[PDB]
């Protein structure tokens, strides 16, 4: 059973914390039963969702526990007590919010695609560089001209430790777009979702004219400077 804790994206956007314990590489076994428990004798809510059998001679199942937010930041060692007779181990996998991490805000920089890629004319690549977040749970989401993009057009990397700050983690979100889309404006906005952020959301934008441009078309008009000023 994989131990997947619900990230901050679930508890912020979905307004609900679904404690999932997904079984992996389970050879097919009838009557799969999943329950949910705490470190102590109290039991959090058992699973209500079940999944159909996988066609590759395997069985799929996803547990759930619609616990509140404030006891998700309690920090107790919640365990998914999977009732199984084929395996005598209950597979009580532990997932909780770690209290020891001290919050740090992620700053997003939007690197425009390099000229060595735009000259190749195949496809531009804008990357959102999310650096310096300690809770290791960033939800980097990508839009286009104010309209959100598909979740498969961009790949957000797993968070990795920063080179200099050891307690801060960084992520790399990369979006591949066609080359004529970048040269026709169409401002791409990278938005992140994170705990240490003030409004939980930070947005940066680039386009052809913003990110590392080869032209600055500034036309200052200081009109009426000899006319009236108190």
């Amino acid at each position: 059973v994989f131990a997947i804790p619900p990230s901050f994206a679930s508890i912020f956007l979905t307004k609900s914390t679904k404690l999932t314990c997904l079984v992996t590489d389970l050879t097919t076994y009838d009557s799969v039963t999943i329950s949910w428990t705490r470190q102590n004798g109290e039991a959090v809510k058992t699973h209500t969702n079940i999944s159909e059998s996988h066609p590759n001679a395997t069985f799929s199942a996803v547990g759930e526990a619609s616990i509140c937010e404030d006891d998700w930041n309690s920090g107790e060692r919640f365990t998914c007590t999977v009732t199984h007779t084929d395996l005598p181990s209950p597979l009580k996998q532990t997932i909780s919010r770690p209290k020891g991490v001290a919050l740090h805000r992620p700053d997003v920089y939007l690197l425009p695609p390099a000229r060595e890629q735009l000259n190749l004319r195949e496809s531009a690549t804008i990357t959102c560089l999310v650096t310096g977040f300690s809770p290791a749970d960033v939800f980097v989401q990508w839009m286009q001209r104010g309209q959100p993009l598909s979740p498969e057009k961009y790949v957000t990397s797993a968070p990795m430790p920063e080179p200099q700050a050891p307690g801060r983690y960084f992520a790399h979100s990369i979006l591949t777009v066609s080359e004529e889309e970048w040269n026709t404006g169409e401002t791409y906005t990278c938005v992140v979702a994170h705990e240490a952020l003030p409004n939980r959301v930070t947005e940066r934008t680039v386009d052809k004219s913003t990110g590392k441009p080869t032209l600055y078309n500034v036309s200052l008009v200081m009109s009426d400077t000899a006319g009236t000023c108190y």
């Binding site: 956007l13 401002t187 004219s209 009426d224």
Partner: protein, 127 residues
């Protein structure tokens, strides 16, 4: 002695005036006008819309900067009355203002919720 003529923090123009005490005779003292204008090279046309195109033309009507459309009080013999200080008025905002925090709302989707959350276009402005 740089008296602050305007301190417009929305177009970043600062105009200051002084009498340079240049010579002994009190007439040729030059009335010096210090227009200091910060041009944001990367701010968009609409600052509150971060998806707006890049602001290229920066027009600064200096009479529009120097208007004083806050009525002031004057003390008459029998009355105190609000007094208009200009005939001009009856806002592009090339730059953000430090005191004012600007928020834009983004569509954030996870499972099709589209929870519209406000960002902070200027961080460290309302924190």
């Amino acid at each position: 002695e740089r008296i602050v003529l305007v301190d417009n923090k929305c177009k970043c123009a600062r105009i200051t005036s002084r009498i340079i005490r240049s010579s002994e005779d009190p007439n040729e003292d030059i009335v010096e006008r210090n227009i200091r204008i910060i041009v944001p090279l990367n701010n968009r046309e609409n600052i509150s819309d971060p998806t707006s195109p890049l602001r290229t033309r920066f027009v600064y009507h200096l009479s529009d900067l120097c208007k004083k459309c806050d009525p002031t009080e004057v003390e008459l013999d029998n009355q105190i009355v609000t007094a208009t200080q200009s005939n001009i008025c009856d806002e592009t905002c090339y730059t953000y203002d430090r005191n004012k925090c600007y928020t834009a709302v983004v569509p954030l989707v996870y499972g099709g919720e589209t929870k519209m959350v406000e960002t902070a276009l200027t961080p460290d402005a309302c924190y």
